[PDB]
Swiss-Prot record:
Monomer. Belongs to the glycosyl hydrolase 22 family. Substrate binds at D101. One of its GO terms (cellular component) is extracellular space. It catalyses: Hydrolysis of (1->4)-beta-linkages between N-acetylmuramic acid and N-acetyl-D-glucosamine residues in a peptidoglycan and between N-acetyl-D-glucosamine residues in chitodextrins. Lysozyme C is capable of both hydrolysis and transglycosylation; it also shows a slight esterase activity. It acts rapidly on both peptide-substituted and unsubstituted peptidoglycan, and slowly on chitin oligosaccharides. Keywords: Allergen, Antimicrobial, Bacteriolytic enzyme, Disulfide bond, Glycosidase, Hydrolase, Secreted, Signal. Residues 1-129 form the C-type lysozyme domain. Its EC number is 3.2.1.17. This is Lysozyme C. SMART domains: LYZ1.
Length: 129
């Protein structure tokens, strides 16, 4: 699905993301613009061979089942392609837990560089929720 700016994210709050586990709603919409370009079908195989999946860019190495990942933990218990699907109602669950790890946003590389120190609520500005 190709999502628009203001219509790609209203569902996050529909899935519990408002100031969840201390992260502001100012910090969520920035990152996906930096991991799959508002796109759900973008998954990218790192040099590490653990292919990343979804807008979220989740790698096959620590979280989901693809089978081309040796030694994969698969803590998420979900087929990796179940993430990319037109319906995103379940992928956020693993996301909503990835941070509880105590690394929170550390797992994502874009928020730490492109979204850190930014005008984050300026990504939620101008929209109706």
């Amino acid at each position: 699905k190709v999502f628009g700016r203001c219509e790609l994210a209203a569902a996050m709050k529909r899935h519990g993301l408002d100031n969840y586990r201390g992260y502001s709603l100012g910090n969520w919409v920035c990152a996906a613009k930096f991991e799959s370009n508002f796109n759900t079908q973008a998954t990218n195989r790192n040099t590490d061979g653990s292919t990343d999946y979804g807008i979220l860019q989740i790698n096959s190495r620590w979280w989901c089942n693809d089978g081309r990942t040796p030694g994969s933990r698969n803590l998420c218990n979900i087929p990796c392609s179940a993430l990319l699907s037109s319906d995103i109602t379940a992928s956020v669950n693993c996301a909503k837990k990835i941070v509880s790890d105590g690394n929170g946003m550390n797992a994502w590389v874009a928020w730490r560089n492109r979204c850190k120190g930014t005008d984050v609520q300026a990504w939620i500005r101008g929209c109706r929720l």
